[PDB]
Amino acid sequence: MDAVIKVIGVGGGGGNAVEHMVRERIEGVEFFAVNTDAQALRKTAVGQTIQIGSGITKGLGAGANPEVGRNAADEDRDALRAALEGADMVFIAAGMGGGTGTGAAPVVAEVAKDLGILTVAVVTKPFNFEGKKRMAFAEQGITELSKHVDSLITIPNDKLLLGRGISELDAFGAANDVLKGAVQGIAELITRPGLMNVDFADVRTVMSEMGYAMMGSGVASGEDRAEEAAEMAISSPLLEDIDLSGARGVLVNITAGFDLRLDEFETVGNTIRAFASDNATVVIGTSLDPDMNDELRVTVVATGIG
Ligand SMILES: Nc1nc2c(ncn2[C@@H]2O[C@H](COP(=O)(O)OP(=O)(O)OP(=O)(O)O)[C@@H](O)[C@H]2O)c(=O)[nH]1
DSSP states (O other), X not given: OOOOEEEEEEHHHHHHHHHHHHHHOOTTOEEEEEESOHHHHXXXXXXXXXXXXXXXXXXXXXXXXXXXXXXXXHHTHHHHHHHXXXXXXXXXXXXXXXXXXXXXXXXXXXXXXXXXXXXXXXXXXXXXXXXXHHHHHHHHHHHHHHTSXXXXXXXXXXXXXXXXXXXXHHHHXXXXXXXXXXXXXXXXXXXXXXXXXXXXXXXXXXXXXXXXXXXXXXXXXXXXXXXXXXHHHHTSGGGTTOOGGGOSEEXXXXXXXXXXXXXXXXXXXXXXXXXXXXXXXXXXXXXXXXXXXXXXXXXXXXXXXX
């Protein structure tokens, strides 16, 4: 009777983000890597892999065009459907701007949508330094992805992060952490509830067919940890341009250890409701992380923003 939650990394960037999720852990989800790149699929620690297309490139540099990723996913739509069938929720992670993520992520999303599965995408846009062509590919793919998902969180790499000692691996680590934070913050309300369990219908109510979304998070310890974590999440760099009262939905995850108090649940809810609209749907849940002592995290997902 447990929830079935699948997290799909599409292409190299998305596969890299999901590999980070595997290393850092998200409780109770199943991880998949979808890629045209057969070598990436051999190397990945992600437990389930799905090859799309033949895995043989028919032209030098051809794999950078989103049409190749789209055509590859379309050729293997049966394998995508068979992997997704039976899920209660699917997350799609991609770095937009390449050929595979950009082109194949909207195909994966539509397969999930057509199966009736609540589908949330968490994707990045390329750094400005990657050039206008990749940015144009990324934005065109986000237009297409937005037609096939219930909620879309778009993280511009330019907003997150460059200087000495910061490698390319380090630069994408920041994006990986945000993508993980969004997937973890939503999924773990279902897979590892604390004293106030959210009901999945409430997750569906604030995420199904909602459109654009954005996440912020905060963490605090001490006597006032609950209000402080919530205030930090609302003031997070990703929510700075977003008024929470313009969000048709708000989903909130309070994560902490065994001591999470009902009065802390009430405090967080009071804080979030102070910022949210009365003409919206608000959902506050908790997750239990037995390894957390003192610390309390609040993750806020504003949905239906525009
Ligand atoms: N999080 C993360 N993002 C990456 C990584 N590498 C590249 N990106 C970003 O994701 C975008 C797409 O890059 P890739 O994923 O490698 O391209 P892809 O979708 O596999 O498609 P192709 O390589 O063209 O076949 C890039 O333009 C970068 O902005 C990575 O290792 N981790």
